[model samples]
Target: EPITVKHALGTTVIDHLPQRVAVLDMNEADFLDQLNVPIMGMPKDYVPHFLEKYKKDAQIQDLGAIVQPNMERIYALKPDLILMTPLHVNQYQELSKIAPTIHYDINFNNSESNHIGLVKDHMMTLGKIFNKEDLARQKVSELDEQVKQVQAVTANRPERALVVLHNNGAFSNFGIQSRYGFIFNAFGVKPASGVVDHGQPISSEFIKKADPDILYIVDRTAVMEHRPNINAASVENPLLRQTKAWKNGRVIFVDADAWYTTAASPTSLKIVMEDVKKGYQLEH
Candidate 1:
């Protein structure tokens, strides 16, 4: 059964279902995990707790970093298929020499509001490759339903939310159309500000100005281990303390690893929904 996949790099023909798969992106790894696909190699950095079982299994090889893959180790693994994204598109030719490579570009000119569509497309591509179209469609359907449920719960909620990432003693705010925009889109919550873009340096003035009803924080420093610091003191500031979210105890600290890095996948998005539901006390 031969299948040709058209991706960011180009078309790749797979002679048959791939048995040994190497995923270069954590989001794709989450997608494959949902489809019950076995991965042979994955990056060892910032692995989510949900994936600990696979790490412990020791069947999946540590392929080093996603940005800078260990080509030597990847060659040793001899994978039948290698999954990547636009970030690794430059290495497509090099990786193809090792195995059939498909670059799934999910983030190219994509908005947070419509990012889930890309996730579905990525899933369908994997489904076609693995002959799991039925399962993939079912999972997508489930994700859609969950999304709707979250929307309904947050529709009339009075909370106008703001999402930000705390990294290396600085804060970067993400708006409606940004990477974390799903917080406003799928969750049906309104943004506290008009900065509907990727990210910008945020300050206490920005927090006071936005005055969001709910503050969603992703601790990049802690998740990436970029620095050694305490959480409470890092986020505590005079201007931030006076904000509505801080005063009302509505600050939501989400899983930085999943939200910042792996939110594009079905499994990771489920955790996002659960986090919002619990944070806002949304009715099930």
Candidate 2:
């Protein structure tokens, strides 16, 4: 069916419903998988656990990393369409030369009203491209319900938490606006450090001063760089050990790949919510 779809970039007229899609972003891949839409290829390095089977079935091709896609393989597959994010906006001409490419202008975040709006915008864009508006709406409803469930469980529980990202040997903290800020903005969790925007290097003095009740950590080096045995121990220093989160068994380790890389997708959203429920010991 031929249809014209409006997106952040502009309007694209698909001669027919595209059967083969090459999505560069992990989040978009999750959206397609949730809609039972199979993608022809994705970045080979960051295949999330949910899509492992698809890899085994040879239903998905390894197209290198998100920032650097393999043009050779992409050309060989002859994808009908290519979906990407603003990060890949610079590659528009290169990618579009192979097939119709759409750069998602929406920014995925956790502002007071930004998260939901971005989610809907992203889903709707994909829905229009695939002509699956009904399924997209249904998934959004499910996502909202999952959020409500988490909020209901932590409604009044005032647990101050610190969200941290450990990359290699450096430590940084993320607030409500950082990459993993959804911990506070979406999960309704209170921030312990009083930091609400931008991620900065974590200081022992800061942890001691903030003294949070719960600490959520994501190991970027382990997930992104494939380093082994990297965990909470890497961030524990004499000053950090003295904090309330460290001594009270409140330090929670989450899936770094999902939280940092593939976040804002339907599959990752549910997994994140579930991780919070268990990490915070919230009611089912």
Candidate 3:
């Protein structure tokens, strides 16, 4: 029996999703956990990140990297339904053969309104598929209220903040329109600059010039790659140290896995917000 579910992407069909499942994407795992559904695996490569708590608690299995998952191990779990993201759209044919799979677009448009809108839609879609509309609606409402609470507290704050994503030793600024831009946009914090382009490596000179009151950074993956420190390399250079954020220590380092990967889920939104407030010591 193919059960069809509508998602942000389009109509999806799942045939008897397992009671115990393996989720390859963090956002998928996060949403399942919120739905009170258990997961068989997730990205366990990055520890010290909050998601590590779930692994330690025996909540789910850390399957492997989404970019390059261990197909053999994932197949062993016999996931009833495999949730995927746009990043792997091209691999759909191969993945679908393993199990019923649905692809979700990682809303990268960084606008608060857009993110909230799609999330609301996703909740309904997931509700319909899972036969949990009431639960989904309830959770969505709660998430909205929590967002408002944080927004109300920090909305009027005059502090300016900048969020940047670092990947493969390159850095890029995140605007209110990029993925996870709502973290600051919801708090009414404006980006000191524009959003970085797709797959572009941003230079640290921009950060030094913007010198926002608060700084935020996100990473794309959780493997803790054995690469050189981009930030250290940037800051150590005399030309980049002149920025007010670096000079005054107003920088707040966010957990890349939380801020970028799993924390995008509706349930983890509050977790992300709370972490943002606490990290900046916002007076709310």
Candidate lDDT values, in order: 0.79, 0.76, 0.63
Q: Each prediction's Cα RMSD? A: 2.5, 2.6, 4.3
Return the number of clashes found in candidate 3. 7
Ranking by lDDT: 1, 2, 3
Give the Å shift of residue 115 in candidate 1. 1.0
Q: Candidate 1, which segments miss by more than 4 Å at Cα?
A: 108-110, 196-198, 226-234, 282-284
Q: By TM-score, highest first, what's the ranking?
A: 1, 2, 3
On residues 170-248, what C-alpha lDDT tens digit does candidate 2 reach at each position?
7678776766666777778888877554366777667767788887777777767776535566664565567787887
Residue 136: error of model 2 in Å?
A: 2.3
**Model 1 global lDDT (CA atoms, 0 to 1):** 0.79
Which model is ahead, 2 or 3, in terms of TM-score? 2
Which candidate number has the best TM-score? 1
Off by over 4 Å in 2: 1-3, 108-113, 196-198, 228-235, 282-284
- Pick the winner on lDDT between candidates 1 and 3: 1
Cα shift from native, residue 81, model 3 (Å): 1.4
The best candidate by lDDT is 1
